[PDB]
Design a protein around this ligand. Structure first.
Ligand code: SF4
Ligand code: SF4
Lengths: 611, 611
């Protein structure tokens, strides 16, 4: 076997047992890695488990591209049954831990059980130990990684959780290298529930490559193509922050809990403003187009800015000064909580306060109040911090505020306001893990323009475009696993991927093979949700928030415009037709058989009727 | 006598003598105060003196508006014979020193002589002393003022020089409250040449007012008019920083030593970027429309930004990040040196380096090199730093780089590139103290738009507009002395001024009375220059820099356009006709008699032939 090790590191925190599981080359070829491998593991090992119980499996899954010098191939997938959504949950982050896990001889790391006290997992090739982290517990993510490196050396990959993870904030994430984050659906809370403070990894092994020279050649070509792309200069300057102006121009910038798609103060929180306050730039392993832009916040502290962070903690909160939004951003990284769900939870509180629903709490534009709430959420201080720490779905159940609860499947909607964007609304509605733009950022195509540089339509071809994008963004890139931005942003040819894959693994994958592996992952993931939800499931699970159907844009040429539910419903049926799912969004028996998921049928039938 | 004290504090640092000069009420009425009073004093007391010798007079002149609660009436004029230009030199700054000097019982303070060692002047009502400042010498302006208040208390007004003043940098200024500056033509160097490190002032006396009730009424109306003006909100947000975009849009933003009027990276150093970096907002005494916008620079330090500072230290130097420009800005303030002349001098060096004329030094866009040169100028360290510390006129004589030496009469050109703006070019050409936009910011009217919110033309009305603006901006406002921005930016009515002047002094001044006093000051100032130049004077003294006639814009729909020498010369003759001046730029015997300036006739006749 080349590329894949066929090895998965297993750590049981309850028993202290550490072992290496060998999985068949057939499974590796069939699921490829990252999310695929994770979905296979969770389907088999997390049936009916409580997300915060010792039985949940915390998975760190790499893929064949990882550990090797592949173009922006320093990504890693973190997965577990989600404490926020109750379904399959995952996330991705660039981190040296990805390079080291693979160079240490493993394709993935699976943590089960729960330690008796705070501990961290140490991995140096074949030497794996569960060590006491009593001294680290309570420290920020930044401080935890800094201290671990002060002991073991700079040459290690470190994954940590901060107080939000330790306190089981439902959208707590895993942090690496002060800025890289993974696991919006609460991977950080699953990590915290096991009393797992960090993971330190070092690898030195040579990963067996089927064609060393092709690999080295293809990689050099791709790097050069990136360096020579016309978008490279502007990408180097603004990175994802170029989307603030682009979204504002197109009425897609979430403003005041998604109330409007335009923000009057977007310029003072945009990419140009960011350029003027940038002090450093860093990136993920093996990437020659770094986009981790670091600024100084209002308190003079370094903060790494990404578009989503700014959109959800800036315009979405009615906060118009980038230096202030940057303080909130830093807090999220330090505490280890998702900037998106954090911002949407805060915005939800702000709307409830302005409406008189909540007697106390911050209002839109209130930076000091937003900062205090962010901190109270991470430390679960007071009734408000505790409520908001649960996310908008849970919070809305308690407050009767479902009308303005911006989420899909319990996962908070990200940085694109879709009052007039049917395809993007469908992307959020059908995202495998819950509302996220990860799997299909189709709004650009719907508009005809993109950040590096209108008539509302429900054409069934939009459902086809979303499935196509999900195959690449929610499948391929989450399985390799590698950054999708070189392709998305600078236009690196997708042809490099199946070639790099054969050069590495020696297996020839055609685009249809890849499209099929991605579809298998999608149906398996959906199957997981259906099974864990005990068959209680229908098409409404794939609907975007009610706000986009009952309210419209508040300003500009498109004022009053919104989504037509009837037409959205028809577009959803088209999505199901293309995926081979029934009108409830559940995979059909024939579809499962065709995707080599026969094993799913018996289990799903114990819970509902299949078609 | 009301309003005016009719008293001038006299401090001789050579003899240690402190006395109070009582001057005539008719002189007070005739010159009003500020620059008018200063020009009267310099004509009489700085005849033929070397600017850096003990005989030069350093004047801190206030007017009837000062010390009283008048709308933005906390300004102060600092004047002396200029070490940079060799003629009349002055500047203005907002400072509690203004309020305290007048409440202490004086209309002005005149310092003559030179101390044997560093000293500071201490003024508390009638108690005035020259005290040792040996421990303060060498400290920054910020630290000097901070330490003085730690001794004397926070309720004092303080004026200081930093190392640039101490080291006689030709464009050294006087600084107050970390950000307020005065005296571009080297007032700081004059102060430093006297070994005067600072002036600390405290006043408690009630200033006699003709009509206290009218004064209170008018000020209140004016304050409310400011608060309710349509421009108030945007002014509060961006202040003068709104000019970066306005100038860039109009090809008037000095870029790379005025090479072009358009900067490709203007957005990253503009007013919106500043808003996203603002952490504090300060202002001058008695102002309800504060514009001292404080940001954190690239090193996390506070830096108060003004348009000119950013245009001359940013676009003019090819530096496109506001955080970096802010480091240069803070250095200028700390060292006590003019941001404009500093930037124009650094830009001059950058062009000479690029052109190979200088073999060592910073080039455009080199922030680290610019910072090092700014520090070397302040401390006069090295041949290059010592040369640039002399100003562009002097530096150009040594390097043979007159072609790109942007100055008029030795004073560096400010933040408006006039390749296609004849009236603004004439404003710079005729400015009483040398190149400055202070006396006539006519570019706004020439274009038809303003920052608060084209066809070239040499229409003789342009000269009439420059004269009208000079009467107000270089006359009235420099004599009161009060901020001209409420009127300029927010549209406060000019009708308040004659009414407040009457309520204060009891003397009624019709607009014609004020225009005559302003022209009187302009002709007296002109007479001072001619006299001091020993009659060596002609119309070329009032010409804009050669570059605006010799080259044109480098981009935009106006690419290649420049000023025309013949049409400019005709426009200048129109300016002379309106002012009653020779074709050499010297007042006519009839004009001098007209303005009650007969005493200057004998003096000018001794040096040249009058008309
Ligand atoms: S483009 Fe950005 S997110 Fe992608 S690998 Fe590079 S630094 Fe990481
Ligand atoms: S408008 Fe600005 S410069 Fe004028 S008095 Fe007010 S704070 Fe000072």
């Amino acid at each position: 076997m080349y590329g894949w090790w066929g090895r998965i590191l297993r750590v049981n925190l309850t028993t202290g047992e550490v072992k290496v599981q060998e999985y068949p080359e057939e499974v590796a070829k069939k699921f490829i890695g990252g999310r695929g491998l994770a979905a296979w593991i969770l389907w088999n090992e997390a049936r009916g488990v409580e997300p915060l119980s010792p039985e949940n499996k915390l998975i760190f899954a790499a893929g064949p591209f990882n550990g090797l010098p592949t173009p922006s191939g320093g990504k890693l997938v973190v997965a577990a049954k989600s404490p926020l959504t109750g379904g399959y949950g995952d996330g991705n982050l660039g981190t040296m831990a990805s390079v080291h896990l693979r160079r240490a001889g493993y394709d993935a790391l699976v943590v089960e059980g729960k330690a008796k006290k705070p501990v961290y997992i140490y991995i140096e090739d074949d030497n794996v130990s569960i060590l006491s982290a009593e001294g680290l517990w309570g420290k920020t993510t930044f401080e935890t990684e800094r201290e671990l490196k002060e002991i073991h050396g700079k040459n290690v990959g470190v994954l940590t959780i901060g107080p939000a993870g330790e306190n089981l904030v439902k959208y707590a994430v895993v942090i690496s290298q002060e800025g890289r984050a993974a696991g919006r659906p609460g991977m950080g809370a699953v990590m915290g529930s096991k009393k797992l403070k960090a993971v330190v990894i070092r690898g030195t092994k040579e990963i067996p490559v089927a064609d060393k020279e092709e690999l080295k050649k293809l990689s050099q070509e791709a790097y050069n193509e990136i360096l020579n792309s016309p978008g490279y200069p502007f990408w180097k300057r603004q990175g994802t922050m170029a989307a603030v102006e682009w979204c504002n121009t197109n009425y897609a910038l979430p403003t005041r809990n998604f109330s409007d798609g335009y923000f009057e103060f977007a310029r003072s929180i945009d990419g140009y403003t960011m350029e003027g306050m940038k002090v450093q730039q860093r990136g993920c392993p093996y990437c020659n187009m770094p986009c981790g832009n670091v600024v100084l916040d209002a308190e003079g502290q370094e903060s790494e800015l990404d578009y989503e962070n700014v959109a959800l903690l800036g315009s979405n909160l009615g906060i118009g000064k980038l230096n202030e939004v940057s303080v909130l951003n830093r807090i999220a990284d330090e505490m280890g909580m998702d900037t998106i769900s954090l911002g949407v939870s805060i915005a939800h509180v702000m709307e409830a306060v302005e409406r008189g629903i909540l007697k106390e709490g911050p209002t839109f534009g209130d930076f000091k109040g937003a900062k205090q709430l962010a901190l109270d959420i991470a430390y679960r201080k007071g009734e408000l911090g505790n409520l908001a720490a649960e996310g908008v779905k849970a919070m809305a159940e308690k407050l009767g505020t479902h009308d303005f609860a911006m989420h899909v499947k319990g996962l908070e909607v990200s940085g694109y306001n879709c009052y007039i964007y049917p395809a993007m609304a469908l992307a959020y509605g059908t995202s495998a893990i819950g509302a996220h733009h990860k799997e299909a950022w189709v709004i650009a195509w719907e508009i005809g323009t993109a950040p590096i540089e209108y008539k509302i339509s429900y054409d069934p071809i939009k459902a086809q475009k979303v499935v196509e994008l999900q195959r690449l963004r929610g499948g391929l890139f989450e399985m390799l696993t590698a950054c999708r931005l070189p392709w998305v942003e600078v236009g690196l040819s997708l042809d490099y991927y199946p070639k790099l894959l054969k050069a590495i693994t020696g297996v020839t994958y055609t685009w249809d093979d890849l499209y099929k592996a991605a579809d298998r992952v999608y149906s398996l993931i959906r199957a997981y949700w259906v099974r864990e939800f005990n068959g209680k499931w229908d098409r409404k699970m794939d609907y975007p928030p009610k706000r986009w159907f009952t309210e419209g844009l508040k300003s500009g040429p498109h004022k009053g415009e919104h989504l037509d539910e009837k037409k959205y419903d028809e577009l959803l049926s088209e999505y199901y037709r293309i995926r081979g799912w029934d009108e409830r969004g559940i995979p059909k028996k024939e579809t499962l058989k065709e995707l080599d998921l026969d094993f799913v049928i018996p289990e799903l039938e114990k819970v509902t009727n299949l078609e």
